[PDB]
Structures are given as C-alpha cells and as structure tokens.
Design a protein around this motif. Structure first.
Motif, PDB file in Angstrom:
ATOM      1  N   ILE A 175       0.862  -1.166   0.000  1.00 31.97           N
ATOM      2  CA  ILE A 175       0.000   0.000   0.000  1.00 31.97           C
ATOM      3  C   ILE A 175       0.897   1.213   0.000  1.00 31.97           C
ATOM      4  CG2 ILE A 175      -1.670   1.355   1.244  1.00 31.97           C
ATOM      5  CD1 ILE A 175      -2.907  -1.181   2.242  1.00 31.97           C
ATOM      6  N   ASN A 176       0.778   2.022  -1.031  1.00 27.08           N
ATOM      7  CA  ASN A 176       1.615   3.192  -1.209  1.00 27.08           C
ATOM      8  C   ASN A 176       0.683   4.385  -1.276  1.00 27.08           C
ATOM      9  OD1 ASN A 176       3.337   5.206  -2.062  1.00 27.08           O
ATOM     10  ND2 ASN A 176       4.479   3.856  -3.439  1.00 27.08           N
ATOM     11  N   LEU A 177       0.698   5.232  -0.253  1.00 29.05           N
ATOM     12  CA  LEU A 177      -0.162   6.403  -0.283  1.00 29.05           C
ATOM     13  C   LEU A 177       0.547   7.580   0.352  1.00 29.05           C
ATOM     14  CD1 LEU A 177      -1.767   7.315   2.604  1.00 29.05           C
ATOM     15  CD2 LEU A 177      -2.887   5.159   2.196  1.00 29.05           C
ATOM     16  N   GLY A 178       0.367   8.745  -0.247  1.00 31.76           N
ATOM     17  CA  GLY A 178       0.960   9.956   0.267  1.00 31.76           C
ATOM     18  C   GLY A 178       0.479  11.150  -0.519  1.00 31.76           C
ATOM     19  N   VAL A 179       0.591  12.312   0.110  1.00 26.14           N
ATOM     20  CA  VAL A 179       0.138  13.573  -0.456  1.00 26.14           C
ATOM     21  C   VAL A 179       1.356  14.436  -0.725  1.00 26.14           C
ATOM     22  CG1 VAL A 179      -1.256  15.615  -0.090  1.00 26.14           C
ATOM     23  CG2 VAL A 179      -2.035  13.419   0.763  1.00 26.14           C
ATOM     24  N   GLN A 180       1.405  15.034  -1.903  1.00 26.59           N
ATOM     25  CA  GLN A 180       2.477  15.933  -2.281  1.00 26.59           C
ATOM     26  C   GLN A 180       1.884  17.307  -2.525  1.00 26.59           C
ATOM     27  OE1 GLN A 180       4.184  14.097  -5.715  1.00 26.59           O
ATOM     28  NE2 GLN A 180       5.483  12.759  -4.487  1.00 26.59           N
ATOM     29  N   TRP A 181       2.720  18.329  -2.462  1.00 28.65           N
ATOM     30  CA  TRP A 181       2.258  19.694  -2.615  1.00 28.65           C
ATOM     31  C   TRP A 181       3.165  20.432  -3.580  1.00 28.65           C
ATOM     32  CZ3 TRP A 181      -2.132  21.593  -0.288  1.00 28.65           C
ATOM     33  CH2 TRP A 181      -2.692  20.787   0.700  1.00 28.65           C
TER      34      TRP A 181
ATOM     35  N   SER B 136       3.751  24.625  -5.583  1.00 29.15           N
ATOM     36  CA  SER B 136       3.386  25.927  -6.118  1.00 29.15           C
ATOM     37  C   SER B 136       4.458  26.300  -7.121  1.00 29.15           C
ATOM     38  CB  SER B 136       3.282  26.977  -5.013  1.00 29.15           C
ATOM     39  OG  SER B 136       2.995  28.251  -5.551  1.00 29.15           O
ATOM     40  N   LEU B 137       4.075  26.437  -8.378  1.00 32.27           N
ATOM     41  CA  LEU B 137       5.060  26.641  -9.424  1.00 32.27           C
ATOM     42  C   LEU B 137       5.307  28.116  -9.709  1.00 32.27           C
ATOM     43  CD1 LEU B 137       6.790  24.944 -11.321  1.00 32.27           C
ATOM     44  CD2 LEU B 137       5.009  25.158 -13.040  1.00 32.27           C
ATOM     45  N   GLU B 138       4.506  29.012  -9.133  1.00 33.11           N
ATOM     46  CA  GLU B 138       4.741  30.440  -9.322  1.00 33.11           C
ATOM     47  C   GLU B 138       6.052  30.865  -8.671  1.00 33.11           C
ATOM     48  OE1 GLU B 138       1.506  32.616  -7.608  1.00 33.11           O
ATOM     49  OE2 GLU B 138       1.497  31.420  -5.767  1.00 33.11           O
ATOM     50  N   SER B 139       6.219  30.566  -7.388  1.00 32.18           N
ATOM     51  CA  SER B 139       7.517  30.571  -6.727  1.00 32.18           C
ATOM     52  C   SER B 139       7.774  29.124  -6.353  1.00 32.18           C
ATOM     53  CB  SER B 139       7.510  31.463  -5.491  1.00 32.18           C
ATOM     54  OG  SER B 139       6.624  30.945  -4.514  1.00 32.18           O
ATOM     55  N   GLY B 140       8.686  28.470  -7.067  1.00 33.21           N
ATOM     56  CA  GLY B 140       8.670  27.026  -7.017  1.00 33.21           C
ATOM     57  C   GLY B 140       8.953  26.522  -5.626  1.00 33.21           C
ATOM     58  N   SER B 141       7.939  25.914  -5.025  1.00 31.26           N
ATOM     59  CA  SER B 141       8.053  25.354  -3.691  1.00 31.26           C
ATOM     60  C   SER B 141       7.255  24.069  -3.672  1.00 31.26           C
ATOM     61  CB  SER B 141       7.538  26.327  -2.633  1.00 31.26           C
ATOM     62  OG  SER B 141       6.158  26.560  -2.797  1.00 31.26           O
ATOM     63  N   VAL B 142       7.907  22.965  -3.363  1.00 26.09           N
ATOM     64  CA  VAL B 142       7.267  21.669  -3.459  1.00 26.09           C
ATOM     65  C   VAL B 142       7.457  20.926  -2.155  1.00 26.09           C
ATOM     66  CG1 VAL B 142       7.538  21.527  -5.937  1.00 26.09           C
ATOM     67  CG2 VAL B 142       9.315  20.658  -4.461  1.00 26.09           C
ATOM     68  N   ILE B 143       6.468  20.117  -1.811  1.00 21.52           N
ATOM     69  CA  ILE B 143       6.646  19.015  -0.885  1.00 21.52           C
ATOM     70  C   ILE B 143       6.566  17.765  -1.739  1.00 21.52           C
ATOM     71  CG2 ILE B 143       5.722  17.788   1.069  1.00 21.52           C
ATOM     72  CD1 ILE B 143       4.680  20.489   2.075  1.00 21.52           C
TER      73      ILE B 143
END
Lengths: 48, 50
Positions: free
Chosen positions: B35-41, B43-50
């Motif tokens: 079972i593989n589950l996770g949430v990513q985030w 914002s590409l305007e000012s590139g910031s990722v989780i």
C-alpha cells in the motif's frame, strides 16, 4: 608300473594281476570328484 | 569346471531389474501486497514543493 592317458583320461597298468586287484582298487579309490565349493559368489549390494 | 562356474555367475547376473516410477511434486506459492499512499504539494509560481 603305471600309465594313463588324458586323451581318454584312463589308468593303464603294467604288472601283476595282484597289481590288477590292488590297482583296480586304486582305479576306484581316487575317482571321486570334489563337491562344488562355491569358490566364487555374486553378492547383491543392498545399499552401497 | 570353469564353465560350470561362469554359468552360475551368469545365471545370477542375468536377473530381472525392477523399475521405479519417480514422481516429483513441486509447490510454489507466492503472495504479495503493498500500500503506497501519500500527499504531495506544489506551487510553481515561486517554485516550492513538498
């Protein structure tokens, strides 16, 4: 005295009718053939 | 005499051979799970990722 032939395998004799008595006795004495001795044997290995 | 010996050897080496039926059985039972589950985030305007 004594002879034999192994073409025939037969004792021949030269001498007495006493030599004929006793040497028909020895005609008969060693005529016997030894019973088989199982000189060789084939053995069935169970495991080895 | 040697003839009567070798005929008794041949007589005992001439025997019938029994024959085996070899039946293998192979059992391979695999099972799997995950079972593989996770949430990513992002914002590409000012590139910031989780």
């Amino acid at each position: 005295k004594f002879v034999a032939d192994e073409r025939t395998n037969s004792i021949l004799i030269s001498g007495d009718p006493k030599v004929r008595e006793r040497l028909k006795r020895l005609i008969k004495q060693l005529d016997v053939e030894m019973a088989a001795k199982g000189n060789n044997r084939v053995v069935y290995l169970k495991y080895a | 005499d040697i003839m009567n010996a070798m005929l008794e050897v041949i007589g005992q080496l001439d025997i019938r051979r029994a024959q085996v039926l070899i039946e293998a059985l192979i059992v391979e039972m695999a099972e799997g799970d995950g079972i593989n589950l996770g949430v990513q985030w992002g914002s590409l305007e000012s590139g910031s990722v989780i």
